[PDB]
Each structure stands twice: as structure tokens, then as C-alpha cells.
Amino acid sequence: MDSKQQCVKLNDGHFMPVLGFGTYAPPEVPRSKALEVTKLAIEAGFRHIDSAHLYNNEEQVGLAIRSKIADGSVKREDIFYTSKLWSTFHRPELVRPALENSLKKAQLDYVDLYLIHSPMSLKPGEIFDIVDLCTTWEAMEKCKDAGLAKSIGVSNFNRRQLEMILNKPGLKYKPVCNQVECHPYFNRSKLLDFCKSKDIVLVAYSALGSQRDKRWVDPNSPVLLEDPVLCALAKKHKRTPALIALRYQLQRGVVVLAKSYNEQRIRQNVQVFEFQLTAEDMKAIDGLDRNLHYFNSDSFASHPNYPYSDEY
Ligand SMILES: NC(=O)c1ccc[n+]([C@@H]2O[C@H](COP(=O)([O-])OP(=O)(O)OC[C@H]3O[C@@H](n4cnc5c(N)ncnc54)[C@H](OP(=O)(O)O)[C@@H]3O)[C@@H](O)[C@H]2O)c1
């Protein structure tokens, strides 16, 4: 079996656990649930915890972390906590205060990772905004220099959006990661190759096929975990389709998130470290790639900085 504490070194010298706990739940789920399930996740062995301003759960997630520190289960340095800058805060003067507010919500001194949530800028408050993300990035760099974030990265960027940052004059810090939709139906092979070539970690969200939220996802879309190839592999290994989907990412060198608000499934998901897929299994999963991103709404596709038009 693998070690549950497996991590990879980021391009700034910090370390990221390769399995992360996804904390988003839709608004119909009471806010208090995030507290309970984040503690369960830590109990089960998750150390990388993924939150965001958008999730309206930072207080609950922060309290769970601090509760597990206070009772001696973990130390702060054992936890890798991520938050994200929401798209109405892209204007550079709004970036550091947004992080400060996230830190105060979680009652933490620092985040391990702060991401630009999305390249699709939205007007402060709110429609679409036009912001040079290089200016947003410079403000992110200042957050790292001040120690508010140990590491900084991006999310939902394509190759060209990454290149704009990487080629920026006077760049101080490369993004450590690009957190993107990634699963066997949309495996991001070319983007993965590019990220690897630049010492940028690809972090997979919706690795289990997304929460299929009606705001963002077509109910007609095939359900990832119902896929016959994933189910046949689950049968072969006497695992579950979810575990096959998570293991696939680990064997590609992708850091993988998994959201569950169910005690049994939270505990199940850490078993990703407990088996392997063969080369032939991995080939079978690669065959599933079909250019299906579950997040697929007019609200994204019509945006000037929508990442999905380019080849990768
Ligand atoms: N950067 C971004 O724009 C972005 C976008 C999407 C997500 N994310 C992050 O990534 C996290 C995960 O992605 P996601 O929210 O799309 O969900 P996901 O990890 O793809 O999970 C989808 C669903 O799978 C179910 N599940 C979990 N374990 C299972 C298992 N072992 N067997 C059968 N079903 C299982 C969960 O339902 P139950 O809760 O009922 O178990 C969950 O709702 C998010 O919570 C968030 O932290 C980021």
C-alpha cells in the first residue's frame, strides 16, 4: 500500500499532499455540515483541505481544522489548507484584503495555498469585467511575500492563460498549480504535459464526475461513476468506481481532490493509496477521454476568458 501522507514538492519548496478533501456543498446543505464532515475527513486521514471564498464555508472548515489541532489529532503544519480568490476580487487592490478576510473567517494565520479561482473576471460586486490577470498575479505575489499564503496558484486556466503569467516581465513566483476539471471523460492530457514541463502541478477537481449541480451541469451528461469501463475495473480490483477514478489521477502524477459529505465515502476515499492499476487498466481509462466538461453553462461559455475554446 502507499503512504496516506504522500506529498509532492511544489516549485516554491513547499509540499502538497497528493489527495485532498473537497469541501464545497450547495446552499441547500446547512452551513454546519462542513464542520462535521471536515473533522471526519481529518479523522479519516485527509490533510489537504480545499476551500474557497465562494463556498461560504471557510468559518466551518477553519473551525474543524482548529478543533483537530486543539484536541491533539494534528498540528497546523500537518494540514495543507487552500482557499481561493473569487472572481469579483480580481482587481489588484482587492486581492490582499480578500485573502485577509478568508484568513479571518478560518481564524488561521496563513493559508498553505491561495488560488485565483477562475480567469473569468466578474464585475466587483455584482456581469463580466476586464482585468489584466498579470496585475492580479502581482498582488498574489505580494501575499506570498507577506506570508499570508505559503504558496500561490491558479485554477481553471488554459495553456495560454498560464503562459501570460509565466512570461510576465518581472515575474517573481510561478503558479505552483493549476486546479482544473479533470477526470476520465476530460483527462486534460495535453495541459498536464504542459504543466509538468513548467514545474506546475495539475490538481484535479470533479475527479468523481462533479456534484452535477443544476446551475452548472447538464443532467443529460453521462454519470462518470456509472461508466462501464470504470465499473468493470472496480469489479476486477474489488474496489469502487470512485476509487478507480481517484487512483487513475495518482498514477498520472495528478493531485486529486474528492468531495464527500458522507462518513462512509469519506473513509472509503483514503483507500486510494491501498491498491494499484496496471498499465492495461490505465490504457482502458485513457480510452474514456471524450472532451466532456461537466461545468458547462452559458455563464461560462459566453465569458471572454472562458478557458475551453483552445485545444488546451
Ligand atoms: N476550482 C474550481 O473551480 C472547482 C470546481 C469544482 C470543484 N472544486 C473543488 O473540488 C472538490 C471536488 O470536486 P466536486 O465538488 O466536483 O466533487 P467530486 O469530488 O467530483 O465528487 C462528486 C460526488 O461524488 C460523491 N462521492 C464521493 N466519494 C464517493 C464514493 N467513494 N463513491 C460514490 N460517490 C462518491 C460525492 O457525493 P457525497 O457527498 O454524497 O458522497 C460528491 O458529491 C470541490 O468540493 C471543491 O473543493 C473546485
UniProtKB/Swiss-Prot annotation:
Tissue: Expressed in many tissues including adrenal gland, brain, kidney, liver, lung, mammary gland, placenta, small intestine, colon, spleen, prostate and testis. High expression in prostate and mammary gland. In the prostate, higher levels in epithelial cells than in stromal cells. In the brain, expressed in medulla, spinal cord, frontotemporal lobes, thalamus, subthalamic nuclei and amygdala. Weaker expression in the hippocampus, substantia nigra and caudate.
Keywords: Cytoplasm, Lipid metabolism, NAD, NADP, Oxidoreductase
Pfam families found in the cross-reference section: Aldo_ket_red
Domain of life: Eukaryota
Pathway entry: Steroid metabolism
Name assigned to this protein: Aldo-keto reductase family 1 member C3
Family as reported in the entry's similarity comment: Belongs to the aldo/keto reductase family.
Reactions it catalyzes: a 3alpha-hydroxysteroid + NADP(+) = a 3-oxosteroid + NADPH + H(+); a 3alpha-hydroxysteroid + NAD(+) = a 3-oxosteroid + NADH + H(+); prostaglandin F2alpha + NADP(+) = prostaglandin D2 + NADPH + H(+); prostaglandin F2alpha + NADP(+) = prostaglandin H2 + NADPH + H(+)
Site, Important for substrate specificity: residue positions: L54
PROSITE patterns membership: ALDOKETO_REDUCTASE_1 (PS00798), ALDOKETO_REDUCTASE_2 (PS00062), ALDOKETO_REDUCTASE_3 (PS00063)
Protein localization: Cytoplasm
Sequence positions that bind NADP(+): 23-24, 50, 155-156, 179, 205-211, 259-261, 265-269
Residues the UniProt record annotates as site (Lowers pKa of active site Tyr): K84
Recorded GO MF terms: 15-hydroxyprostaglandin-D dehydrogenase (NADP+) activity; 5-alpha-androstane-3-beta,17-beta-diol dehydrogenase (NADP+) activity; aldo-keto reductase (NADPH) activity; aldose reductase (NADPH) activity; all-trans-retinol dehydrogenase (NAD+) activity; all-trans-retinol dehydrogenase (NADP+) activity; androstan-3-alpha,17-beta-diol dehydrogenase (NAD+) activity; androsterone dehydrogenase [NAD(P)+] activity
PANTHER family tied to this protein: ALDO/KETO REDUCTASE
GO cellular component: cytoplasm; cytosol; extracellular exosome; nucleus
Site (Involved in ligand recognition and product release): W216, F295
Activity regulation comment: Strongly inhibited by nonsteroidal anti-inflammatory drugs (NSAID) including flufenamic acid and indomethacin. Also inhibited by the flavinoid, rutin, and by selective serotonin inhibitors (SSRIs). The oxidation reaction is inhibited by low micromolar concentrations of NADPH.
InterPro entries the record matches: AKR, AKR1C, Aldo/ket_reductase_CS, NADP_OxRdtase_dom, NADP_OxRdtase_dom_sf
EC category name: oxidoreductase
E.C. designation(s): 1.1.1.-, 1.1.1.210, 1.1.1.53, 1.1.1.62
Gene transcribed to yield this protein: AKR1C3
Binding annotation for substrate: H117
Chain's role: Cytosolic aldo-keto reductase that catalyzes the NADH and NADPH-dependent reduction of ketosteroids to hydroxysteroids. Acts as a NAD(P)(H)-dependent 3-, 17- and 20-ketosteroid reductase on the steroid nucleus and side chain and regulates the metabolism of androgens, estrogens and progesterone. Displays the ability to catalyze both oxidation and reduction in vitro, but most probably acts as a reductase in vivo since the oxidase activity measured in vitro is inhibited by physiological concentration of NADPH.
One BP term from GO: positive regulation of phosphatidylinositol 3-kinase/protein kinase B signal transduction
